[PDB]
Amino acid sequence: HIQKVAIFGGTHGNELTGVFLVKHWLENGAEIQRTGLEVKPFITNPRAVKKCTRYIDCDLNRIFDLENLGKKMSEDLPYEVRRAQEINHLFGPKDSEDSYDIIFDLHNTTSNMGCTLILEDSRNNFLIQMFHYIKTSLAPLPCYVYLIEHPSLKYATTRSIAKYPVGIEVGPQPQGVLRADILDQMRKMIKHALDFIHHFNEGKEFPPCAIEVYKIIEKVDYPRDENGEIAAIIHPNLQDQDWKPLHPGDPMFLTLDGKTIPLGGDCTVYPVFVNAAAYYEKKEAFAKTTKLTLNAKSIRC
Amino acid sequence: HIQKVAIFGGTHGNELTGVFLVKHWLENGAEIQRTGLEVKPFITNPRAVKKCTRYIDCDLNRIFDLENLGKKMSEDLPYEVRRAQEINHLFGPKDSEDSYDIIFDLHNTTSNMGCTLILEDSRNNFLIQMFHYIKTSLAPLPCYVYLIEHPSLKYATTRSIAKYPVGIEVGPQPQGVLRADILDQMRKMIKHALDFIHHFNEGKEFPPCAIEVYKIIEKVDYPRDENGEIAAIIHPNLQDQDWKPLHPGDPMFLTLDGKTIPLGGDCTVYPVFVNAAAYYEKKEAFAKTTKLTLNAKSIRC
Numbered sequence A, B: 001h002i003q004k005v006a007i008f009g010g011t012h013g014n015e016l017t018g019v020f021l022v023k024h025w026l027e028n029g030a031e032i033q034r035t036g037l038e039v040k041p042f043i044t045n046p047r048a049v050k051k052c053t054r055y056i057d058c059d060l061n062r063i064f065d066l067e068n069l070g071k072k073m074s075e076d077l078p079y080e081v082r083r084a085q086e087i088n089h090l091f092g093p094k095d096s097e098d099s100y101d102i103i104f105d106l107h108n109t110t111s112n113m114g115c116t117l118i119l120e121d122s123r124n125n126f127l128i129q130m131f132h133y134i135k136t137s138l139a140p141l142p143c144y145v146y147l148i149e150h151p152s153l154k155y156a157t158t159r160s161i162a163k164y165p166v167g168i169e170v171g172p173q174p175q176g177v178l179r180a181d182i183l184d185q186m187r188k189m190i191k192h193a194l195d196f197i198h199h200f201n202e203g204k205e206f207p208p209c210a211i212e213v214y215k216i217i218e219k220v221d222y223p224r225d226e227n228g229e230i231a232a233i234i235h236p237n238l239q240d241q242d243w244k245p246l247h248p249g250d251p252m253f254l255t256l257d258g259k260t261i262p263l264g265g266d267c268t269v270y271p272v273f274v275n276a277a278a279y280y281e282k283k284e285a286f287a288k289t290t291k292l293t294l295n296a297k298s299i300r301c
Ligand SMILES: CP(=O)(O)N[C@@H](CC(=O)O)C(=O)O
Pocket: A012, A059, A061, A062, A107, A108, A109, A118, A157, A167, A169, A276, A278
């Protein structure tokens, strides 16, 4: 059933783990080859990799929609828009049946999140089953799932071209830095993801399963000042405590004085992307998520 | 004896702890004010801070020498060269007796180094005594001293304008990220450094003392490709092990294949700036240092 699989690195040019793995596999990709399965590594944003920067003109990972992929090709377009089209033409077109079946898009964050899988559709049995397999196979190494389904949020990502878009994120790693442990963790994530696809194409039957995901609800801004500059910082007790529960009493921010600013609201939330570097650019502190369980049916062929 | 003291933040625009402290103290610098002592906070590279980037045209912290500070002012010069001059004219001139007495230049690294003091002259009794005071005052919080004296090296740093240049570096913090603990650590470093100056200007007598420093000997490159691209990465056992001893047997790098590359040479070395982000730009892995003890005499008003 599953034929065309791709692996994207360098969607942001300062997230090196993907860049390195992909470059290594372009020269020798035996590691990622599975019998009866054609898997293609590919650098998505080579220009931004060259500069070791997030993007050149605009973020590549939020423009794979009709607004942008339908524009008339020209050299006056932002670099990433041109690039987005070239990629859609290679691995897509999107919403087409000639598109790749599965795409893994590799990412790094500074946030202390470890192995993270990113799910775009909560009702997708195939992906849930994959994510279950990976989760299970990594144990006792923790692996979390982050759900970006939202009526009004959710972005037009690079991987979204696929029938089954899979996002992969490993932290904490600084930008422009290549750590071995983080690299090793992403490797293992991949091998199990490919193992799952192979197991599936050899027609293995998976029983129903259930997994905890974390559903984005809101992004929290840093408190500001009358000029609009940031006024407080992630409180020590929240630093590095991604995925762990935070109750309305608990400390959130801290001023340089420093009075504490506690959570507020009436329910427990799970913060993710705590003090992420990519959040500063937009002056955001972290993401509020809701923990919940999803279910899948059985699958075959 | 000591009159003019300055504190520099934003010498690199993505090293936020300095930026934040300095901005906070420009609005209210009571924290850094000591009796009979005028200390001036100051953002060195406002343009690079604006963009949250290391530098605009060239690294500000390498160009405070005759080659650059003697150039004819013009708008065709790289931004940082213009800026370097403006600063030399404010807080210097360098090698002059009208220069500031002491300058603290604040920095962050991604390397797991904690509180670090940077010493440019090994024969300086005043600085050693300060560094001793700070070291001891921070205990049991570790504080290390890194000596950049070298016959065949330079470093025309921002702070070098002063009679007594002091460098301050706290890691690990990602670039474009502001962590509370790291901020707190730098604050304490400053407070004790200012306390020392005040104690000295109230004419306290310090007995002779001794401190371990780490003398740079060379910078280690990443092993490269046949094209010139990086070929291995800091071995897991070296990651985050700054300051700790590394013997010729021990593992250094790691290829994506599995093969370890051990140290070599014939003596124990102490690595610092392990997997520093700012080292990638020049494709360097870390700095080899040699641990040794320095001695100071007594000192007075
Ligand atoms: C921290 P990131 O740059 O990997 N976050 C992405 C989301 C993603 O990776 O899907 C973005 O906001 O574009």
